[PDB]
Write a protein that binds this DNA or RNA. Sequence first.
DNA 1: ATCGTGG
DNA 2: ACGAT
DNA 3: ATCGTG
DNA 4: CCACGAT
Lengths: 401, 402
Amino acid sequence: GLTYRIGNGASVPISNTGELIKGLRNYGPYEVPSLKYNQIALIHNNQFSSLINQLKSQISSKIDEVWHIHNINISEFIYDSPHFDSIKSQVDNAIDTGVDGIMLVLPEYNTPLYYKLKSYLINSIPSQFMRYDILSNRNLTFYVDNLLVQFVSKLGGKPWILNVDPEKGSDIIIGTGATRIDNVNLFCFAMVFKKDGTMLWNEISPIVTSSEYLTYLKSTIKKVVYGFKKSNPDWDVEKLTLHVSGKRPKMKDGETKILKETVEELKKQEMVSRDVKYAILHLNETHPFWVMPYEGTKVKLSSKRYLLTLLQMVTPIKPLSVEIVSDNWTSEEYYHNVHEILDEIYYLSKMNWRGFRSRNLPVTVNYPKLVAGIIANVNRYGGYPINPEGNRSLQTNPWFL
Amino acid sequence: GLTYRIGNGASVPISNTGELIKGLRNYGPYEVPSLKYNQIALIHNNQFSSLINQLKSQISSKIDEVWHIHNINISEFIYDSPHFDSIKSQVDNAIDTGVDGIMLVLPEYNTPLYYKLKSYLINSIPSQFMRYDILSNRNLTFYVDNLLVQFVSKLGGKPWILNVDPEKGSDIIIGTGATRIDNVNLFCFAMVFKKDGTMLWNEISPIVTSSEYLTYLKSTIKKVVYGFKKSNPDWDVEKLTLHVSGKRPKMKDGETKILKETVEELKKQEMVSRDVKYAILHLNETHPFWVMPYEGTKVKLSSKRYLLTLLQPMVTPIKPLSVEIVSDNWTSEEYYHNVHEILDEIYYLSKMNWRGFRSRNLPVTVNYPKLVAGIIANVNRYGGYPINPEGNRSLQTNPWFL
DNA sequence: ATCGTGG
DNA sequence: ACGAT
DNA sequence: ATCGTG
DNA sequence: CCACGAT
Ligand SMILES: C[As](C)(=O)[O-]
Ligand SMILES: C[As](C)(=O)[O-]
Ligand SMILES: [Cl-]
Ligand SMILES: [K+]
Ligand SMILES: [Mg+2]
Ligand SMILES: [Mg+2]
Ligand SMILES: [Mg+2]
C-alpha cells in the first residue's frame, strides 16, 4: 500500500500514471519550484512552425494546470544555423534577458553538438533538450507530459516523494562508488539521499585513472557529507546506509576498508552520531528474466547476499543483487535491519524523476548512471567540464535528468 | 489442481499424504502387483524382538489394507551371526522356498555389509532392506507406510501415476547422461518414461573411463529404446524429449552432436517416427535460495534457458532447476508452445517419486538416475556383485534402485 | 539402509 | 538430530 | 536528445 | 539503430 506524497498533503497510489497526473492537477506537486524570473526560453530554428506552436501551447498549459507553476511566460529565440556557435549565441541571448530555464530544440541527431551544448547549459542554467525530427512523428501529449517531469525537477521542483515511516529506514543513504568511462579512466561519485528518495547533495571527482580510485572515493564521500552537514547542521545521522555501485576496479577488500575508515573519520568529526549504526551494501544489476505477485519480493541467496525482483504471458523482472559487505549491527537486531534496508532499496526504486513511467531501479544506483553518461560523453566529444563543487545549484539539483 | 490417479478410476490431489493413504485404502493403488508365490520373506536377527513383531504385523496389515495385495503370507528366517555368509545363507534359504520378495533387517549402518548384500539381492529378487537399530514405536507407522511404497514398486506394482492431458507433452521422455563414480570412471544410463511418470525401461552401461563416455552414451540409449520398442511395438513416438543430467565429462558440443546422431539412427531403424519432433534438454540442480505462489513458476532467462522454481517440501526454500534447450527440430511457429509443454512436463515429473509418500520435488528423470548412481558407485567401492540390467527383464522393467 | 531436512 | 499422515 | 522495452 | 507504446 505504498503511495507518493504530492502537494497539499495529498497522497496517491504508486504504479498508476493516470491517477498521478490527476492527483497533480488537483493538488499540485510535492514542491512547486520558486522561480526568479517566471520566464522560460524556447530556442529553436523553426520559427513559424505550426508544431513548435503546438508544443509551446501544451507546455504552457501543462506547466500551469498540472505543475501549478502560474504566470509563466515563454520567450522564443531563433538560431539561423544548427552549429554550436550559432546556437550558443541564442543561449547567451536568452540568459542575459533573465530566464529560469532553457528548452532547446535540436534539428537532428548530432552527438558532439549535443554534448557540447548540454555541458555548456549544465554549467549555466537548468535545461531540457528536444529533437524536432523525433517530435514530428510522436504523440505530443505523452511527449510533453513526461518531458515536464524532469524539466520541473531540474528547475528545483519536487514532483512527488515517497510516503515512508520516519521510524524506519536510514536517516540518510549515500549512493557512492565509481564508474568507468573507458578501459582505464573513471570518476567517483557520492550522493546523499533522504529515505523518501529526495537527493540532498551530490559530488563527483575529476576523471582519474583506476589507480587513483580509492583515494578519490574517500575524498568524494567526505566532500558530500561535509556539504550536506553544512546545509543541514541539525540533521541527526544515527542510522546510515551506503549503496555502493558502478563498474569500477575490483578491489573489494581494499574498498570496504576505506569505506569503513571514512565512516569512523566522519564519526570522529561528529558529522554523524556518536554511535551511528551503519551498513555498507553493494548493489548490482543482474541478468534480467521473465516470469512465464512479485512486487516487493525479497530473495535470500546467503547470509549476506540478497536479491530484489524489481518489476518493470510474461512478467519482465530486473533483479537487483544486494550484498551486505560490512555493518556494526548487533546480532539481535540484524535480521530486522536486513528487512529495513531491503525495503528501503525497494522504495527507492520507485523514486526516479525522469518521467511518469521511469525504470524501477534504486535512485541511489540510477542517478549515478545518468551522471556517468554525461561525464563519459563530454570527455569523449570534448564539452565543458562539469564541476559541482562550489556550485550550489549543481550540488543540490538533479541536473543529470 | 494436479492429481494422482490411483485404483478404480479414483484420483487424489498432490501434496497431501493423508488423503493419498486414505485414497489407497478406499480404492487401491493404480496397479496391484501380480505375484507368483503370494509369499514374502522377512529375514532378521532378533527372534524375540517386540519391535520386529510389531514390524511384521504392521507390514501384514498394510500390504492387505493399503495396497490391496490380499492373502500374502510372510515367512520368517533367522540368521545367527550378523555377518555376510550367515545372512546370505538365510537369503538363499528364502529364495529356495519360493518367494516374491525379501525384506531384510540388518543390525545397524554397516556400509560394506549393506552394499555387498544389496548387490546380491538386486541380482536375485525384489528386496527391501531395514535397520534393526532404527525401528521405534514412535516412528513405526511412518516407517512401514513409506517402506511399502517402494517395496510394492519393486514388486512391480504402480502406487500412483500422474493425471496428465494425453494430448500434451512427450510420447516418451528419455532420462540419460552419465555419473562419475570417481575422477576417472563413470557409467552411462538411459531410462524411458511415460509422460505420466511411469518408468518403462532402463539400461546402464558398464563402468568405463571418461574417455569412453560418448561411445557408451550412444550405445546405452539405443539399448533402452530397442528394449522399450520390443516390448511396446505399437507405441507411436511422434514427440520425444531427452532429459540429460549427471556429473559427467565437459563435452557439451560433442555430446549434443552424438545425441542428435543417436536420435537420427533410431529414426532410421523405425524405433521412433521418421518425423519425430524432439528436443534435447540439460537439467541441472542449482543453488537453493529462500524467498523472504512459487509452486510451478517458470522463469525464462533467454530463448534457450529456463528455470523451474521447485519448492522444497518468514523463509520458504526453493530448489531451482535449470533447463537448457541445447537442440530441437521445432518450427519457429510452435517453439514457445512447445517450451511451455516441456517445462510443465518437467514440473509434473517432479511430483513422481515412488520412494515414499512425500514428493522429492525433483524430476524422476534426474532423481532415479541419482539413485542408480548411488548403488553403482558404492557397489564398486565396496566390492559387491556387479549390476547390469541387460538380459534381465526384471531389472530392465522394475525400479530396483528405490 | 522408511524417507527427507538441517546442521 | 528430527519430523512426517 | 520525453523515456522506456525488445 | 530502429519499431512501438505510454495517461
Ligand atoms: C570547453 As570546450 C567546448 O572548448 O571543450
Ligand atoms: C562380492 As564377490 C568377490 O563374491 O563378487
Ligand atoms: Cl521403541
Ligand atoms: K538384524
Ligand atoms: Mg533528460
Ligand atoms: Mg547384473
Ligand atoms: Mg530404498
